[PDB]
Ligand binder design. Structure first.
Ligand SMILES: Nc1ncnc2c1ncn2[C@@H]1O[C@H](COP(=O)(O)OP(=O)(O)OP(=O)(O)O)[C@@H](O)[C@H]1O
Ligand SMILES: Nc1ncnc2c1ncn2[C@@H]1O[C@H](COP(=O)(O)OP(=O)(O)OP(=O)(O)O)[C@@H](O)[C@H]1O
Ligand SMILES: [Zn+2]
Ligand SMILES: [Zn+2]
Ligand SMILES: [Zn+2]
Length: 580
């Protein structure tokens, strides 16, 4: 019942009983909270509630200290004092309290519902202590809301991959995509796609009628470590030992590797195809005796670093850390769960508590402030390297419905990269034809991204609005897909292209009609393909977001066809226009 104030670190015996996280607040900060919000329940060693029989007064502003007990105005003894007085709520340490001038920001964080983009803006521009409080509060709210979705029970099993579901009446249904993972009853985790529903299970299990699926929730632990440790700048390389014979394949990053060793943490912005994994793995080659923990949010990102390390690092010194409660198939070519190896590859959620000379945290645009705090709490390192690109996509915020979240507010690292700039920048795209490079360089990179490749003359655009149908909220554009079918009859080298759309439902229609592999933009992040076919599908904030569009067109190595709905983005594509 005694702790440190979330706003000013002062010792206190008070917590707000109305905030979902029950934060400690000192006598001064607690006053500013209760006098300006609906939160009136104050918790101490004992709760601040009227102590007379039958009384239900719990509003601290209507409560008084009589002796050592609390009473309302109708029950207080003649010798009593108001609990709220002199800008202070009575509690222990009433004279050491410092107070804070940021309580207004606390009050907004503590009372918002996380549906507006301004809640996330405030969560990223406040003090460091408030950032943790907002991250914890948001995550709890997100987790509790998962209880709002209905239960799904199998009515019949059509095949090994299709079934008919029964949805609980009185509650909304979750969208059926690869981001919504249900737990079956425990017969493993399942995902559903679109009355027949396509089901994918962790193991091939004989599903029965009556088995049910529940959205996988999770308890939310408190945070203690900052999103970023305080910065330090050193006179020379600290804790690391450079080689003298780094191969020329990695020598262009030597100066950047030196800078990594001169500061506590450093940020690297790497636009698509500019060599992020190459940078990350070369860091180990330049500091060959360093213990390096490579981490990121998704298994796919960690597995991509593993594939890179397999080519260049000693395999006997690598371990992939896979949580015992297995879920998906991870990289399998390293020793598994040998936490003490020199090179450890692990998703954030599964990080062991250990130390390292260097922590590399990849795909930083996808991280949240909760992730960044978890990484600092579990990994004590001499150097932290944050790799990513704030012009790519963030983690979906399931509660946000009003307003768009700009890159500067994705997390603390993206905020630094957007405000003061990244410590390092990989400036040459080696993956994409120059038509793409030139488009995105002007679109999101202030013309700072250079093309190494020539124009391919296989980059095409077509302006075709089509017809927009919907499966709930996921959009479909059958005319746009018909145009693609026509294109394929006349361009047989594209038979091997990957279809990309901003919508799962569109992708599903394309799979059946066109026969091509399909991917959503968001799931295509970190991937590359020779030929890509993109159908914008609709003109929405989702389909026109510049970060998503950047990602979409930068997956292609040789050629891309973009069937567009928005005039602005169509015009900016530096491609050859196709007729019809
Ligand atoms: N790979 C290495 N090559 C050469 N000398 C090394 C190497 N690793 C450690 N040493 C030496 O051994 C000492 C003790 O190692 P230790 O790991 O405890 O220190 P350190 O954390 O790297 O030190 P500092 O941060 O002051 O550089 C180092 O300070 C350094 O002088
Ligand atoms: N600094 C560099 N110097 C020389 N060649 C490089 C450099 N960075 C990357 N390359 C070349 O580009 C190839 C691909 O790099 P990488 O594995 O990082 O993937 P990418 O798709 O280009 O980039 P990213 O991971 O940023 O999307 C490397 O295998 C290497 O041949
Ligand atoms: Zn409160
Ligand atoms: Zn305080
Ligand atoms: Zn009373």
């Amino acid at each position: 019942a005694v702790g440190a104030c979330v706003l000013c670190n002062s010792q206190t015996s008070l917590r707000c009983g109305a905030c979902i996280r029950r934060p400690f607040l000192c006598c001064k900060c607690c006053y500013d909270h209760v006098i300006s919000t609906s939160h009136k329940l104050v918790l101490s060693v004992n709760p601040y509630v009227c102590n007379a029989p039958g009384c239900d007064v719990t509003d601290v502003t209507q409560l008084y200290l009589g002796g050592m007990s609390y009473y309302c105005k109708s029950h207080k003894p003649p010798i009593s004092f108001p609990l709220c007085a002199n800008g202070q709520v009575f509690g222990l340490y009433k004279n050491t309290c410092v107070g804070s001038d940021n309580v207004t920001d606390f009050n907004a964080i503590a009372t918002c519902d996380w549906t507006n983009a301004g809640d996330y803006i405030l969560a990223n521009t406040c003090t460091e202590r408030l950032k943790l409080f907002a991250a914890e509060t948001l995550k709890a709210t997100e987790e509790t809301f998962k209880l709002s979705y209905g239960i799904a029970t199998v009515r019949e099993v059509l095949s090994d991959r299709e079934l008919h579901l029964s949805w609980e009446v009185g509650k909304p249904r979750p969208p059926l995509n690869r981001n919504y993972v249900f737990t079956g009853y425990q017969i493993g985790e399942y995902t559903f796609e679109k009355d027949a529903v396509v089901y994918r299970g962790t193991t091939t299990y004989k599903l029965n009628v009556g088995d049910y699926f529940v959205l996988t929730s999770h308890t939310v632990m408190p945070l203690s470590a900052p999103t970023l440790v305080p910065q330090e700048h050193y006179v020379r390389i600290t804790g690391l030992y450079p080689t003298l014979n780094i191969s020329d394949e990695f020598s262009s990053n030597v100066a950047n590797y030196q800078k990594v060793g001169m500061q506590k943490y450093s940020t690297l912005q790497g636009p698509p195809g500019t060599g992020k994994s190459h940078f990350a793995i070369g860091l180990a080659l330049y500091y060959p005796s360093a213990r390096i923990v490579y981490t990121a949010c998704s298994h796919a990102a960690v597995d991509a670093l593993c594939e890179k390390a397999l080519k260049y690092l000693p395999i006997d010194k690598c371990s992939r850390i896979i949580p015992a409660r297995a879920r998906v198939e991870c990289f399998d070519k390293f020793k598994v769960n040998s936490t003490l190896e020199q090179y450890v590859f692990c998703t954030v959620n599964a990080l062991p508590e250990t130390t390292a000379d260097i922590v590399v945290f990849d795909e930083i645009s996808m991280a949240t402030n909760y992730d960044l705090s978890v990484v600092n709490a579990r990994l004590r390192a001499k150097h932290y390297v944050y790799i990513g690109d704030p012009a790519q996509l963030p983690a979906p915020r399931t509660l946000l419905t009003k307003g768009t979240l700009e890159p500067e507010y994705f997390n603390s690292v993206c905020r630094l990269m957007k405000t003061i700039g990244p410590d390092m920048f990989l400036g040459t795209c080696r993956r994409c034809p120059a038509e793409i490079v030139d488009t995105v360089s002007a679109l999101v990179y202030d013309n700072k991204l250079k093309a190494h490749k020539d124009k391919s003359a296989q980059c095409f655009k077509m302006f075709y609005k089509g017809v927009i149908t919907h499966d709930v909220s996921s959009a479909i554009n059958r005319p746009q897909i018909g145009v693609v079918r026509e294109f394929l009859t006349r361009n047989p080298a594209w038979r091997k292209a990957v279809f990309i759309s901003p919508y799962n439902s569109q992708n599903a229609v394309a799979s059946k009609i066109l026969g091509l592999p399909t991917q959503t933009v968001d799931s295509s992040q970190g991937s590359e393909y020779d030929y890509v076919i993109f159908t914008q599908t609709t003109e929405t904030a989702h389909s026109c977001n510049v970060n998503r569009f950047n990602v979409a067109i930068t997956r292609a190595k040789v050629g891309i066809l973009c069937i567009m709905s928005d005039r602005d983005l169509y015009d900016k594509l530096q491609f050859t226009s196709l007729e019809i």
